[PDB]
Amino acid sequence: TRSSVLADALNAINNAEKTGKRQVLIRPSSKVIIKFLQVMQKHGYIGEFEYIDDHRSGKIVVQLNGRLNKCGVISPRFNVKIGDIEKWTANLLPARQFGYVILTTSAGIMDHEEARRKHVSGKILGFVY
Amino acid sequence: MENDKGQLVELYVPRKCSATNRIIKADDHASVQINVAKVDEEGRAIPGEYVTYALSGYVRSRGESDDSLNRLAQNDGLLKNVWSYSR
Amino acid sequence: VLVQDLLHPTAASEARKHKLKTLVQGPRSYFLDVKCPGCLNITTVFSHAQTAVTCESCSTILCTPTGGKAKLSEGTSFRRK
Amino acid sequence: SLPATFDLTPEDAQLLLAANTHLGARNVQVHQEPYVFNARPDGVHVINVGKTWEKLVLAARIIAAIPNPEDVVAISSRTFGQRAVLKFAAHTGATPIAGRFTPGSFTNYITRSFKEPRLVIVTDPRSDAQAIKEASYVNIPVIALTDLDSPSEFVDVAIPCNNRGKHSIGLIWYLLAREVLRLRGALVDRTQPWSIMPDLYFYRDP
Amino acid sequence: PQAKILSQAPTELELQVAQAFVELENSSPELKAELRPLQFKSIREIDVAGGKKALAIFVPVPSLAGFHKVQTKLTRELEKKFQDRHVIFLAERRILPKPSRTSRQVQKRPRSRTLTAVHDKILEDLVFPTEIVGKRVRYLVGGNKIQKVLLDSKDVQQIDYKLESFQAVYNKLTGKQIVFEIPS
Amino acid sequence: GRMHSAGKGISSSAIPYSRNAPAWFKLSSESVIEQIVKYARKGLTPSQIGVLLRDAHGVTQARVITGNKIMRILKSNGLAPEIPEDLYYLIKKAVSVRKHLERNRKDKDAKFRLILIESRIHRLARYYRTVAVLPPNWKYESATASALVN
RNA sequence: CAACGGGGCCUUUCC
Ligand SMILES: [Mg+2]
Ligand SMILES: [Mg+2]
């Protein structure tokens, strides 16, 4: 059954990117998906996304701009320490100068750059580049 | 990509597809560059004056180059009722 | 494709799609005012009725259940809500 | 960008209607073409002749944008389009390919072959898949007369027309040649019907 | 009577409307049945960009059904009484804050007291006569979110001219960007 | 889906987006509640109460019109059943299969189906015991299932 | 003067 709606959403976005579609519909569009999409949009990997509110869990339509190489989740959400953030980035990212590891922290969902300049840690949530 | 003191150190800054915004590689021999002549004052097809679109080998192989060209053309003008956003 | 308005699909496409596969799901059924051969009430009947609806003050069947939409007993006048 | 003079006219609109260009393929239509107007009964689909004209004008603009007329190659294997491409390359400075395509004409840089065009026009992608394949090999743009069931792979500019009809084939080629000539300036004003009468492009077996 | 419908400490912000609320009641005895028992509370004015102001008449909302039933017929009377003003009836709904990790324990924080749900009900009360047919939430590239509300074609002609007033009042009440449209 | 099969059915009700009663509905909330209590006194389950209500009347959903679900209304009025309705129907089906099996002893397909139905019953009863609908010592017994269904 | 992080006040809410 459905175990990670964030994983489903990111897989759908990855498939749409690989096929060259400039828009994608994802369901059921949870808050964690909203925050992940917000981080991706703020870093410019996706364009505008709009939340469809049916009285069910909802849907999200994202506009893709072709700048996304790959977004995916890390399941399970491993606990990541300050020293382990660097190891995760080295393992997951194509280069040290771009790409983003996204964490869910007590200060909110944010990328590893914001985590390192806020001196916060948490559980790993995904990546984007 | 540039080094310190702002010098462009990467050779061959590459083109991108006008439909998918992906890089046109040096070996992508299925890609095309479509130039459409400009028109003013009853035609005459001004030589050397073009509107340029890049279509990638992936789009062409998927057969989406036609629809992508329709959309891009109509976005730039050049076509009145061919492409519909809603489908 | 590779560009389409997923947020403003055509009404024809939304009518063609399955009732659950539309952008926002909703029922395709409706309700009907049936004029009974008697009087004193205009009877409300579900389109996809499962029960053989009878008159409040009579003994005629208004509809017979079917796999999908119910029939109308072959004597009926019906308005759609 | 194109004025109402470039816009479609009733005379060539009714010319297309007589040529039956709008009578598209049967319920089998490739789901890559929104060029299908409302579906006519008995299965045949009506092709939007307005979109046909607009795409033909765009393709003509591209052909006229190609600097050297000899670097434009018109390709037809079907007899319904062999005369069309021959007369097209007669009126325009194009290079015709009628009959067999002698595969290796874009690769294989040897004699008797290896034309190097900047553009290729094909009457039917299904029967001219070889030319389209070689164009995809050597970065050649493709304009194709595509019916609602014609494949769109490696086809850049699809002009919707009936390809079961020699009338539609000949008239579409005639219109393309006339319009590209008008862009080139051979025809000074876009009000004359270019008196050369459009039966030069129809195939005649007897 | 103002003394009858006080429901709060008398203030000049609402004295005029509470006095005018008696005149139609006196001149329309047939409206006594549905208008007599209902009673309102503090009313505040929201500036609109078109130089107008909107009177958000708040009610403690035990008896919101009465205002809903009589609202379509005294709204026009109220803008006739005083122009340059858009009159809207809102409920007064308590918000309980979401309990924190170190907060004290209160009993279960009913879902009707949540900030999201009360804002949805505020928007419904704002557009009472017209039923909402859809909602969307647009997250711009800049980072701000705007809520689009899709309204049905039926009965919308009583609010078609005060949609901007609705938007201004909602933005003042919440700080959240709203846009109304009627999907045709 | 299809807990005890390979089916992939998706057919279900698609209740409306609107959370309010339709504009053409004029019956009172108390009137529909009285109809509900009358049907329950007649002895109908909530499911068929809702079906008959929606068919012979204009009530699209007692939940949207009366503001309460049908089983909740029945419990509030003191007409709640001794066991939940779905568990009751599962136990009735299990009784029917067990009786059909004790006749003629050779329907191995019936034995398999009875195993499936009893597993379903045990899962539902476990859920009900966890949510405290059923007593913590409640136990489904094949020997008394008939005496419990009637 | 720019960016980044920290804290507090109302906004129906408290440290
Ligand atoms: Mg299982
Ligand atoms: Mg399924």
UniProtKB/Swiss-Prot annotation, chain A:
NCBIfam families: PRK04034.1 (NF003115). It is found in: Cytoplasm. The gene is RPS22A. Its main location: cytoplasm. It comes from Saccharomyces cerevisiae (strain ATCC 204508 / S288c). This is Small ribosomal subunit protein uS8A. PANTHER family: 40S RIBOSOMAL PROTEIN S15A. GO terms for cellular component: cytosol; cytosolic small ribosomal subunit. One of its GO terms (molecular function) is structural constituent of ribosome. Present with 40400 molecules/cell in log phase SD medium. Component of the ribosome, a large ribonucleoprotein complex responsible for the synthesis of proteins in the cell. The small ribosomal subunit (SSU) binds messenger RNAs (mRNAs) and translates the encoded message by selecting cognate aminoacyl-transfer RNA (tRNA) molecules. The large subunit (LSU) contains the ribosomal catalytic site termed the peptidyl transferase center (PTC), which catalyzes the formation of peptide bonds, thereby polymerizing the amino acids delivered by tRNAs into a polypeptide chain.
Curated annotation (Swiss-Prot), chain B:
N-terminally acetylated by acetyltransferase NatB. Pfam families: Ribosomal_S21e (PF01249). The lineage of its organism: Eukaryota, Fungi, Dikarya, Ascomycota, Saccharomycotina. Its main location: cytoplasm. It is found in: Cytoplasm. Present with 27400 molecules/cell in log phase SD medium. Component of the ribosome, a large ribonucleoprotein complex responsible for the synthesis of proteins in the cell. The small ribosomal subunit (SSU) binds messenger RNAs (mRNAs) and translates the encoded message by selecting cognate aminoacyl-transfer RNA (tRNA) molecules. The large subunit (LSU) contains the ribosomal catalytic site termed the peptidyl transferase center (PTC), which catalyzes the formation of peptide bonds, thereby polymerizing the amino acids delivered by tRNAs into a polypeptide chain. The modification N-acetylmethionine is found at residue 1. This is Small ribosomal subunit protein eS21A. Component of the small ribosomal subunit (SSU). Mature yeast ribosomes consist of a small (40S) and a large (60S) subunit. The 40S small subunit contains 1 molecule of ribosomal RNA (18S rRNA) and 33 different proteins (encoded by 57 genes). The large 60S subunit contains 3 rRNA molecules (25S, 5.8S and 5S rRNA) and 46 different proteins (encoded by 81 genes). The keyword Ligase does not apply. Disulfide bonds: none annotated. The gene is RPS21A. It comes from the Eukaryota. GO terms for molecular function: structural constituent of ribosome. Keywords: Acetylation, Cytoplasm, Ribonucleoprotein, Ribosomal protein, rRNA processing.
UniProtKB/Swiss-Prot annotation, chain D:
Transmembrane segments: none annotated. The keyword DNA-binding does not apply. Disruption phenotype: Reduction in growth rate, a decrease in free 40S subunits, an increase in the amount of free 60S subunits and a decrease in polysome size. Keywords: Acetylation, Cytoplasm, Ribonucleoprotein, Ribosomal protein, Ribosome biogenesis, rRNA processing. N-terminally acetylated by acetyltransferase NatA. One of its GO terms (molecular function) is structural constituent of ribosome. The keyword Cytoplasm applies. It comes from the Eukaryota. One of its GO terms (biological process) is endonucleolytic cleavage to generate mature 3'-end of SSU-rRNA from (SSU-rRNA, 5.8S rRNA, LSU-rRNA). GO terms for cellular component: 90S preribosome; cytoplasmic stress granule; cytosol; cytosolic small ribosomal subunit. Component of the ribosome, a large ribonucleoprotein complex responsible for the synthesis of proteins in the cell. The small ribosomal subunit (SSU) binds messenger RNAs (mRNAs) and translates the encoded message by selecting cognate aminoacyl-transfer RNA (tRNA) molecules. The large subunit (LSU) contains the ribosomal catalytic site termed the peptidyl transferase center (PTC), which catalyzes the formation of peptide bonds, thereby polymerizing the amino acids delivered by tRNAs into a polypeptide chain. Belongs to the universal ribosomal protein uS2 family. Present with 93700 molecules/cell in log phase SD medium. This is Small ribosomal subunit protein uS2A. The chain holds residues 2 to 207 of 252 of the full protein.
Curated annotation (Swiss-Prot), chain E:
The keyword Nucleus applies. There is a cross-link at residues 80-81, 121 (Glycyl lysine isopeptide (Lys-Gly) (interchain with G-Cter in ubiquitin)). The keyword RNA-binding does not apply. GO terms for cellular component: 90S preribosome; cytosol; cytosolic small ribosomal subunit; nucleolus; nucleoplasm; small-subunit processome. One of its GO terms (biological process) is ribosome biogenesis. N-terminally acetylated by acetyltransferase NatA. GO terms for molecular function: structural constituent of ribosome. Component of the small ribosomal subunit (SSU). Mature yeast ribosomes consist of a small (40S) and a large (60S) subunit. The 40S small subunit contains 1 molecule of ribosomal RNA (18S rRNA) and 33 different proteins (encoded by 57 genes). The large 60S subunit contains 3 rRNA molecules (25S, 5.8S and 5S rRNA) and 46 different proteins (encoded by 81 genes). Interacts with snoRNA U3. uS11 interacts with MPP10. Component of the ribosomal small subunit (SSU) processome composed of at least 40 protein subunits and snoRNA U3. Present with 41000 molecules/cell in log phase SD medium. This is Small ribosomal subunit protein eS7A.
